[PDB]
Design a binder for this molecule. Structure first.
Ligand SMILES: [Cl-]
Ligand SMILES: [Zn+2]
Lengths: 21, 30
């Protein structure tokens, strides 16, 4: 999930946009 | 050390910023 993907290496806003509703 | 707890507090702010009016879910399954 998001902690795995984005607390282990940096997620840009482009990558985070995946998680929006 | 509470590394994950602190990371999540930042993740929710970054999600808030990119998502805008779309909003987002932040659960145990996210
Ligand atoms: Cl921090
Ligand atoms: Zn911090």
């Amino acid at each position: 999930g998001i902690v795995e993907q984005c607390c282990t290496s940096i997620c840009s806003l482009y990558q985070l946009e995946n998680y929006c509703n | 050390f509470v590394n994950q707890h602190l990371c999540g507090s930042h993740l929710v702010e970054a999600l808030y910023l990119v998502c805008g009016e779309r909003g987002f879910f932040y659960t145990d399954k996210t």
